[PDB]
Amino acid sequence: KTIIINGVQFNTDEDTTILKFARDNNIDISALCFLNNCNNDINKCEICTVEVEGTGLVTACDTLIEDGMIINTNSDAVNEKIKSRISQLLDIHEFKCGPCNRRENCEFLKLVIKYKARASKPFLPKDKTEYVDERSKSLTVDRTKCLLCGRCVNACGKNTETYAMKFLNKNGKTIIGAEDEKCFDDTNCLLCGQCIIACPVAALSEKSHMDRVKNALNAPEKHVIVAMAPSVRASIGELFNMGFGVDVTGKIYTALRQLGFDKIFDINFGADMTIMEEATELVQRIENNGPFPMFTSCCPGWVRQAENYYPELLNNLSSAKSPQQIFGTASKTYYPSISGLDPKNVFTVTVMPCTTKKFEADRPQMEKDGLRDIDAVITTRELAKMIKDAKIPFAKLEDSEADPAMGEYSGAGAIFGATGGVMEAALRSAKDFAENAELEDIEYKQVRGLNGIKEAEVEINNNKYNVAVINGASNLFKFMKSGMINEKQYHFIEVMACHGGCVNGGGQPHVNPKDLEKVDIKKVRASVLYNQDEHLSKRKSHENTALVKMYQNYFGKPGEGRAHEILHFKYKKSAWSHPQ
Numbered sequence: 315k316t317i318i319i320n321g322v323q324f325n326t327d328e329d330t331t332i333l334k335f336a337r338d339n340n341i342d343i344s345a346l347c348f349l350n351n352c353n354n355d356i357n358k359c360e361i362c363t364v365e366v367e368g369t370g371l372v373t374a375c376d377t378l379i380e381d382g383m384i385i386n387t388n389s390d391a392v393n394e395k396i397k398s399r400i401s402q403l404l405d406i407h408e409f410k411c412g413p414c415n416r417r418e419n420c421e422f423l424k425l426v427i428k429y430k431a432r433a434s435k436p437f438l439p440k441d442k443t444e445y446v447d448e449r450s451k452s453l454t455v456d457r458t459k460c461l462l463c464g465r466c467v468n469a470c471g472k473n474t475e476t477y478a479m480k481f482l483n484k485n486g487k488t489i490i491g492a493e494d495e496k497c498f499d500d501t502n503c504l505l506c507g508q509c510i511i512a513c514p515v516a517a518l519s520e521k522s523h524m525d526r527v528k529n530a531l532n533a534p535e536k537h538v539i540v541a542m543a544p545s546v547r548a549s550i551g552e553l554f555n556m557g558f559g560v561d562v563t564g565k566i567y568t569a570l571r572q573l574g575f576d577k578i579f580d581i582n583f584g585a586d587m588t589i590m591e592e593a594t595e596l597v598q599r600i601e602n603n604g605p606f607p608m609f610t611s612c613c614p615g616w617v618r619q620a621e622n623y624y625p626e627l628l629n630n631l632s633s634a635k636s637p638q639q640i641f642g643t644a645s646k647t648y649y650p651s652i653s654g655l656d657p658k659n660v661f662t663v664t665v666m667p668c669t670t671k672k673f674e675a676d677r678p679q680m681e682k683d684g685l686r687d688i689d690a691v692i693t694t695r696e697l698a699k700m701i702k703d704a705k706i707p708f709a710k711l712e713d714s715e716a717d718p719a720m721g722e723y724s725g726a727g728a729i730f731g732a733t734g735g736v737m738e739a740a741l742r743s744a745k746d747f748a749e750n751a752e753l754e755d756i757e758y759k760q761v762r763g764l765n766g767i768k769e770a771e772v773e774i775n776n777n778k779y780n781v782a783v784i785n786g787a788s789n790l791f792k793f794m795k796s797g798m799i800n801e802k803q804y805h806f807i808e809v810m811a812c813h814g815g816c817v818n819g820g821g822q823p824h825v826n827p828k829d830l831e832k833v834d835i836k837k838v839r840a841s842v843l844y845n846q847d848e849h850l851s852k853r854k855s856h857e858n859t860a861l862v863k864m865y866q867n868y869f870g871k872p873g874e875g876r877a878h879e880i881l882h883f884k885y886k887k888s889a890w891s892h893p894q
């Protein structure tokens with residue numbers, strides 16, 4: 315194939331699009347609706363317009379290169395077309411970046427600047443309430459910003475296969491939203507937030523908990539605990555121009571103290587408690603020859619997927635609470651017992667890479683004696699904004715430590731945030747538990763990485779067991795619908811709704827599509843966690859000294875008695891009824 319682009323000749327055997335070939339050869343072509351290898355088929359943005367001699371204007375993102383093509387990417391006709399499309403988008407866009415939560419990393423703003431585009435008539439809605447949906451516990455929609463690019467719809471389809479995000483006809487007007495314009499929570503939506511991650515603008519956002527947090531911090535009698543997820547320390551530095559794959563654990567602890575939090579703990583401590591309980595439950599099932607398989611229960615997007623599509627599996631979920639909720643439960647029971655705090659005055663905040671965790675924390679029954687396990691959940695993005703609003707020089711902060719009593723963590727907890735991390739961590743303990751041993755070989759590399767469905771055979775007390783790691787909600791559907799769950803007897807299955815694990819959660823920093831082709835974000839974020847595991851002295855959850863003290867002095871033996879009564883949560887399918 316001989317191709318000429320802007321007067322430059324190329325000879326290639328590639329079968330690809332103009333857009334992909336140009337970018338591979340360092341020729342600039344803009345794009346908007348193209349992402350995840352698809353564009354908006356029914357309302358093409360045409361920001362990728364180029365001129366093909368003899369054909370006319372074409373969309374580079376979905377036109378294959380062909381021998382004999384002469385292409386111009388930067389002619390007057392091309393730039394006029396692109397400018398006109400951006401101007402038409404501005405006609406339906408509330409262009410007020412000052413107070414906008416994407417002001418610092420908005421893809422639309424970059425295009426507006428690049429093409430010097432302007433609205434024909436500014437869009438200045440007086441009553442935004444009709445454009446905004448804040449009913450959800452996890453997601454919010456601001457349609458004054460929506461470009462109808464379809465990236466959320468395509469991303470939902472690709473990442474979850476639920477198609478919970480849809481194009482809708484709202485009284486003759488095209489919008490995106492949930493089925494029948496319902497609250498997302500009331501549909502089959504997983505609340506995973508992958509649609510947010512795909513959005514180029516501030517149209518999709520997380521449900522804010524920042525007022526909950528600030529009110530608690532400012533309340534004189536509230537003792538505000540904060541604890542961050544495994545993935546936050548591998549990610550948040552991106553929002554302070556520190557690059558990708560930077561471990562910023564110690565700076566986070568310092569920043570949270572400067573924000574006024576009263577105690578600095580860590581969800582990785584909760585990850586070690588989840589393993590304590592779940593590895594014990596696994597050994598119990600092994601000893602009772604069932605029931606099998608046991609599924610993890612720590613990802614609430616997967617729990618929603620089971621509730622909404624596979625309710626027959628709810629009884630197979632581990633009853634261990636997730637790290638967030640198990641930590642929260644202990645923060646209202648154990649922590650008062652070692653601090654003197656009145657439990658009613660403890661206010662527990664988590665920082666998580668996840669929108670779904672807000673829904674999980676707000677589940678009616680996630681409480682005891684009138685005290686919520688978790689009172690507020692802020693995303694990685696929300697914490698970044700609080701740090702910047704406080705004018706805290708994050709990149710320059712010195713490292714501090716967490717408060718140890720609920721802040722120490724093992725290497726097993728540290729890797730929870732990557733796909734296969736829970737599996738690996740759980741096996742390190744279940745194997746020791748079952749064989750009553752302190753095994754030296756603890757690295758389960760077979761369950762790691764970005765393969766969508768991963769299986770391994772493991773030997774526990776000279777018996778072979780089958781495990782699987784399901785990496786992304788679409789892969790859960792593939793595993794079940796294809797009958798793979800029936801090709802062998804599985805005994806323990808990890809499921810995460812977000813491909814890559816929580817490092818790719820719906821509350822994480824947005825990454826520019828061009829940056830995404832330069833950096834493998836899922837692997838680079840995950841690398842921070844595996845590195846911590848490698849360099850930590852304790853690499854099994856049951857070797858966490860602060861956790862052992864907790865169980866010895868307060869909860870007793872895991873998996874039974876007090877621990878089971880307090881630290882577990884069972885999901886139940888609805889009983890048969892007619893009509894459905």
Ligand code: 402
Nearest residue numbers: 543544545585637638668731816
């Ligand atoms: N609860 C909890 Fe988890 C832990 O520990 C997080 O905090 Fe995850 C992360 N990072 C998130 O969100 S949830 C699913 N299990 C894997 S990791």
Ligand code: SF4
Nearest residue numbers: 410411414420515516
């Ligand atoms: S979405 Fe982007 S272009 Fe629109 S107001 Fe916010 S920052 Fe500005």
Ligand code: SF4
Nearest residue numbers: 470503504506507509
């Ligand atoms: S939250 Fe997840 S399941 Fe729901 S619409 Fe967004 S991508 Fe789809």
Ligand code: SF4
Nearest residue numbers: 460461463464466513
């Ligand atoms: S919500 Fe965001 S991703 Fe979805 S169509 Fe609107 S601008 Fe595009």
Ligand code: SF4
Nearest residue numbers: 613615668812816819
């Ligand atoms: S994989 Fe992690 S970030 Fe994604 S929905 Fe599950 S818990 Fe949340």
Ligand code: FES
Nearest residue numbers: 347348360362375
């Ligand atoms: S980027 Fe090609 S049509 Fe939208």
Ligand SMILES: [Cl-]
Nearest residue numbers: 677678679680
């Ligand atoms: Cl509930």
Ligand SMILES: [Cl-]
Nearest residue numbers: 717718719720
């Ligand atoms: Cl402490």
Ligand SMILES: [Mg+2]
Nearest residue numbers: 352353355376
């Ligand atoms: Mg297409």
Ligand SMILES: [Mg+2]
Nearest residue numbers: 530531532533
């Ligand atoms: Mg205070």
